[PDB]
Design an enzyme around this catalytic site. Structure first.
Site, PDB file in Angstrom:
ATOM      1  CD  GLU A 104      -2.635  -1.626   2.293  1.00 15.11           C
ATOM      2  OE1 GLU A 104      -2.169  -1.250   3.391  1.00 15.11           O
ATOM      3  OE2 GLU A 104      -3.460  -2.573   2.190  1.00 15.11           O
ATOM      4  CD1 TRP A 168      -5.343  -6.844   8.447  1.00 11.26           C
ATOM      5  CD2 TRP A 168      -3.683  -6.080   9.726  1.00 11.26           C
ATOM      6  NE1 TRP A 168      -5.851  -6.629   9.697  1.00 11.26           N
ATOM      7  CE2 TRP A 168      -4.853  -6.158  10.507  1.00 11.26           C
ATOM      8  CE3 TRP A 168      -2.505  -5.620  10.318  1.00 11.26           C
ATOM      9  CZ2 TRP A 168      -4.887  -5.785  11.849  1.00 11.26           C
ATOM     10  CZ3 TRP A 168      -2.538  -5.250  11.658  1.00 11.26           C
ATOM     11  CH2 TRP A 168      -3.725  -5.336  12.408  1.00 11.26           C
ATOM     12  CG  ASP A 170      -7.958  -8.299   5.195  1.00 10.98           C
ATOM     13  OD1 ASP A 170      -7.874  -8.479   3.957  1.00 10.98           O
ATOM     14  OD2 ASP A 170      -7.510  -7.272   5.748  1.00 10.98           O
ATOM     15  NE  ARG A 223      -4.914  -1.991   7.526  1.00 10.07           N
ATOM     16  CZ  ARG A 223      -4.377  -1.923   6.311  1.00 10.07           C
ATOM     17  NH1 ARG A 223      -3.773  -2.985   5.794  1.00 10.07           N
ATOM     18  NH2 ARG A 223      -4.443  -0.791   5.619  1.00 10.07           N
ATOM     19  CB  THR A 224      -5.725   2.282  13.593  1.00 10.59           C
ATOM     20  OG1 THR A 224      -4.669   2.576  12.649  1.00 10.59           O
ATOM     21  CG2 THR A 224      -5.573   3.147  14.844  1.00 10.59           C
TER      22      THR A 224
HETATM   23  O1  VO4 Z   1      -5.763   1.503   6.400  1.00 11.73           O
HETATM   24  V1  VO4 Z   1      -7.484   1.166   7.536  1.00 11.73           V
HETATM   25  O2  VO4 Z   1      -8.625   1.170   5.724  1.00 11.73           O
HETATM   26  O3  VO4 Z   1      -8.029  -0.813   7.629  1.00 11.73           O
HETATM   27  O4  VO4 Z   1      -8.452   2.664   8.563  1.00 11.73           O
END
Ligand code: VO4
Length: 282
Positions: A104, A168, A170, A223-224
């Site tokens: 990303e 990550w 998910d 994620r945060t």
């Molecule tokens: O980079 V997060 O779209 O899972 O707030």
């Protein structure tokens, strides 16, 4: 039944009402407004609660969940980098957890600058980045760690530990196991750094707006929030704090989108279930 579909449907019902309630109106006084037309929010409808905002020109919020004190923010825009580095240094940041993936950050379409893996100059601030350990977190997920050294003429030089999760998980039991391993690593990293400041007599130990872990992904709400939820559940001070309470507190202190997706809430539900922690307020 405490963790059955009825209880989960009731939790989702409360949190949905809360999100809808917290949705920003135009020029909402609950939310930090950009001045002069400069872009402040990386996403239009993911805004920054004014009363807990860390800096006027950042999308970043002080968050306290039970007793656990952090900062959650968006991935800084290019124009925000100098201010971002000043926040990190002022806070005496004991750990910076970046949950945006390597792919990303690499996608230039996303406008996420590679600010913690590269040395560079941003205004009068100079940054050096040194990669340190790599820690496996389960199911092939990896944390890359860095020492981020922030220098500015006439300011105390500050070095920030960085935990970068490069990909990550998910959903699932995988995400739950990995999240628990990440929460432990991030909390351990912060404790080591905080201890150093305490051993040097730093006044920052006195100030509870300082020495907070700083956590962000891309928007700072998905994620945060899943990470912040796990860290708060790892805090021994937060017994009997419900999942309702902790998500409601995240949402009032940043925005209604915290815990963006059903899959992220379900990780938090599973961690609470493993602890026998309540889902709902009675
Ligand atoms: O980079 V997060 O779209 O899972 O707030």
């Amino acid at each position: 039944s405490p963790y059955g579909p009825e209880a989960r449907a009731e939790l989702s019902s409360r949190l949905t009402t809360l999100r809808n309630t917290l949705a920003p109106a135009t020029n909402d006084p609950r939310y930090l407004q950009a001045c002069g037309g400069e872009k402040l929010n990386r996403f239009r409808d993911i805004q920054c609660r004014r009363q807990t905002a860390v800096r006027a020109d950042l999308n970043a919020n002080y968050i306290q969940v039970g007793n656990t004190r952090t900062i959650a923010c968006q991935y800084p825009l290019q124009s925000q980098l100098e201010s971002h580095f000043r926040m990190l240094a002022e806070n005496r940041t004991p750990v910076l957890a970046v949950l945006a993936s390597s792919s990303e950050i690499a996608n230039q379409r996303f406008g996420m600058p590679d600010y913690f893996r590269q040395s560079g100059t941003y205004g009068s601030i100079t940054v050096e980045s040194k990669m340190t350990q790599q820690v496996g977190l389960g199911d092939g997920i990896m944390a890359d760690m860095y020492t981020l050294t922030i220098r500015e003429a006439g300011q105390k030089t500050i070095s920030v530990p960085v935990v970068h999760v490069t990909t990550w998980p998910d959903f699932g039991v995988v995400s739950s196991e990995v999240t628990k391993a990440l929460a432990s690593l991030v909390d351990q990293t912060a404790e080591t750094k905080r201890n150093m400041y305490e051993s040097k007599g730093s006044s920052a130990v006195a100030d509870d707006s300082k020495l907070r872990p700083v956590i962000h992904c891309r928007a700072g709400v998905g994620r945060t929030a899943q990470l912040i939820g796990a860290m708060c559940m790892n805090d021994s001070r937060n017994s009997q704090l419900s999942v309702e309470d902790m998500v409601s507190q995240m949402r009032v202190q940043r925005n209604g989108i915290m815990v963006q997706k059903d899959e992220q809430l379900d990780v938090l539900i599973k961690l609470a279930e493993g602890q026998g922690r309540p889902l709902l307020n009675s």
